[PDB]
Write a protein that binds this ligand. Structure first.
Ligand SMILES: Nc1nc2c(ncn2[C@@H]2O[C@H](COP(=O)(O)OP(=O)(O)OP(=O)(O)O)[C@@H](O)[C@H]2O)c(=O)[nH]1
Ligand SMILES: [Mn+2]
Ligand SMILES: [Mn+2]
Ligand SMILES: [Mn+2]
Ligand code: NA
Length: 610
């Protein structure tokens, strides 16, 4: 009801109907309409028409450019201040800090950033009131995972950014079908604003609305809310991407008995026609997308992609670890993507793809560092800063973490069960990062508990810790996350996947990679496949099982330096255990599970006996 006409926002709806919305959805939309004061409310239907028209509108406003070389491809160049995720401005709100991060023994937590309810409410009040003035508030009903999946979760994102709408259509299942399936069911409330109400208080840079000084990406797991202000970019704005997919979802996972992880999912088939699904957690810059879409060099082998970034996994009644890709597309790093490094991505991204912060060629194509493709004489390059650019300048033509946004259904090797509601059975979990020295190409954890330790001990690159590739993404206390992983071993009839650790990045004394990697990583996956089958192809070492002599198929690779590649040094590993000890003691402290501490003791002891 109302004594006037300030609460009913029906008159400002330009697509859809508030009356047709589920009650709790309407309250979410109208309540934030009252707060943010948008000019219009557009309830998205997810249709091709809505999509095409909105892209054309952004094009006319100069917000995006059409890439004329390709089929329905687009380019956005952002404000340089709004180029990536800002961890210092990414927070999780809970009653007690200990529930969000372990209280460190000595230093500051690097496992998350807590903000009190009190401090967030002040921050919220200083940002959102009237922030959508003069703008359309878009209502994005989206599913994270196949619509009918028991592993899927539903979100509603409100945004004043058409860039977010178009990108969410690609990255999630979006539209009217989602609302109809949701009904009076539960959903994650996602609120986003670029933080630039009209009239503009500050000058617009590169037609890219953002408020850097006030940027704040907040997560409120107990309220089932994500609230993001000031940034229009990637993980800060596409609230399904990391905020929902990893931070909120990992909390839900903890509560409900499942796992939300920074993992690719791939299906691998051998020459005997046997197929296994694998998951792998690597940090940013460590090649999940390359592995997920691998073109295998080994004859008779086939790799297929379920997902390249996020895995939602739950042990079923039969004890199989069932996994879905909750995403609907690939939000891949553009620089470094070539025919050599990722040929299947090259194929995917030439239609219906949105590019952000890459360079543009004179004939309307895309360009970036490591594209490994020469241009015809005459073809010139415009950089991501909208500047004339030559191949030999002291400046990259694309932003180091510039991205493409492409539909998953377009991947030539997309898995036939990539959107099967029941998910796919994971038989192996892979951990890894960038280690220039000391860490063998591949090793296998001795048990589930050792495997959890291996994930927890992950380091990459200055070499920094990134446990489970989840350091920027823990939705709650990492110690409790470790306990949650360990508890899976005590679950009824659980078939615990084999756990491996890989290192593509080991270098010799001259700084060149000892392993050719990319397509050649099918040789590593072959060994993993065999080990899952119970093949006697492993040699026991202090760090776990490694391939036997001659176990790894090296045919066609010439003379690979295996002794250096698989070399295990007592002195390196003595230092390794020490640094892992100090890290877990400080960062996890009182929340370090007994079994992780035990695995550290165990590894320390095995190394001492070298
Ligand atoms: N040497 C070597 N480098 C690799 C290999 N696979 C991937 N890379 C490198 O990894 C980088 C690309 O990986 P990213 O796309 O940033 O990794 P990602 O896990 O998909 O990152 P996010 O999308 O942010 O999650 C490039 O620099 C590649 O050269 C490999 O097998 N060997
Ligand atoms: Mn990726
Ligand atoms: Mn990622
Ligand atoms: Mn136990
Ligand atoms: Na722009």
């Amino acid at each position: 009801p109302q004594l006037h006409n300030g609460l009913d926002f029906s008159a400002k709806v330009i697509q859809g109907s508030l009356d047709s919305l589920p009650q709790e959805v309407r309250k979410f939309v109208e309540g934030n309409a009252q707060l943010c004061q948008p000019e219009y409310i557009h309830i998205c239907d997810g249709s091709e028409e809505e999509y095409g028209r909105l892209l054309a509108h952004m094009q006319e406003e100069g917000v995006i450019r059409k890439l004329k070389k390709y089929d329905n491809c687009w380019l956005a160049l952002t404000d340089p201040r709004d180029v990536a995720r800002i961890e210092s401005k990414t927070v999780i709100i809970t009653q007690e800090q200990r529930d969000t991060v372990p209280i460190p023994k000595s230093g500051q937590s690097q496992l998350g950033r807590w903000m009190s309810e009190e401090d967030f409410e002040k921050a919220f009040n200083a940002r959102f009131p009237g922030c959508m003035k003069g703008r359309t508030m878009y209502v994005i009903p989206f599913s994270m995972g196949p619509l009918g999946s028991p592993l899927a979760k539903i979100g509603i994102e409100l945004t004043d950014s058409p860039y977010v709408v178009a990108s969410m259509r690609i990255m999630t299942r979006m539209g009217t079908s989602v609302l109809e399936a949701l009904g009076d069911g539960e959903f994650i409330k996602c609120l986003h604003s670029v933080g630039c109400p009209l009239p503009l208080k500050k000058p617009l840079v590169n037609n890219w609305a953002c408020n850097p000084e006030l940027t704040l990406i907040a997560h409120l797991p107990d309220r089932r809310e994500i609230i993001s202000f000031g940034s229009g970019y990637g993980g800060n704005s596409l609230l399904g991407k990391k905020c929902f997919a990893l931070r909120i979802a990992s909390r839900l996972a903890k509560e409900e008995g499942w796992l939300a992880e920074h993992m690719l999912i791939l299906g691998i088939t051998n020459p005997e026609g046997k197929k296994k699904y694998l998951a792998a957690a690597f940090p940013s810059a460590c090649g999940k997308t390359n592995l997920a879409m691998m073109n295998p060099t080994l004859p008779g082998w086939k790799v297929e992609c379920v997902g390249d970034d996020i895995a939602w996994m739950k042990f079923d009644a039969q004890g199989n670890l069932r996994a879905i890709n909750p995403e609907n597309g690939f939000f891949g790093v553009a620089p470094g993507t070539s025919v050599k490094t990722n040929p299947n991505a090259i194929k995917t991204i030439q239609k219906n793809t949105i590019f952000t912060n890459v360079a543009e060629t004179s004939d309307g194509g895309v360009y970036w560092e490591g594209i490994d493709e020469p241009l015809a004489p005459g073809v010139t390059i415009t950089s991501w800063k909208n500047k004339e650019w030559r191949p030999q300048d002291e400046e990259p033509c694309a932003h180091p973490n510039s991205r493409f946004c492409t539909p998953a259904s377009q991947c030539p090797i997309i898995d036939p069960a990539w959107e099967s509601p029941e998910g796919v059975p994971i038989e192996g979990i892979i951990f890894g990062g960038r280690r220039p020295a000391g860490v063998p190409l591949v090793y296998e954890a001795l048990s589930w508990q050792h495997g959890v330790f291996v994930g927890a001990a992950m380091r990459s690159e200055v070499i920094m810790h990134d446990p489970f590739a989840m350091r920027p993404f823990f939705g709650y206390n990492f110690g409790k996350y470790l306990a949650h992983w360990l508890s899976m071993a005590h679950r009824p009839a659980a078939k615990l996947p084999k756990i491996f650790h890989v290192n593509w990045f080991r270098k010799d004394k001259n700084g060149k990679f000892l392993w050719p990697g990319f397509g050649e990583n099918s040789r590593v996956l072959e060994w993993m496949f065999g080990r899952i089958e119970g093949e006697d192809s492993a040699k026991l070492t202090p760090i776990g099982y490694v391939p036997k002599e001659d176990a790894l198929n090296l045919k066609g690779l010439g003379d690979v330096n295996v002794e250096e590649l698989f070399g295990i040094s007592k002195e390196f590993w003595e230092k390794e255990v020490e640094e892992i000890d100090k890290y877990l003691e400080d960062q996890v402290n009182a929340d370090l599970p007994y079994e992780i501490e035990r695995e550290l003791r165990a590894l320390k002891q095995r190394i001492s006996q070298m």
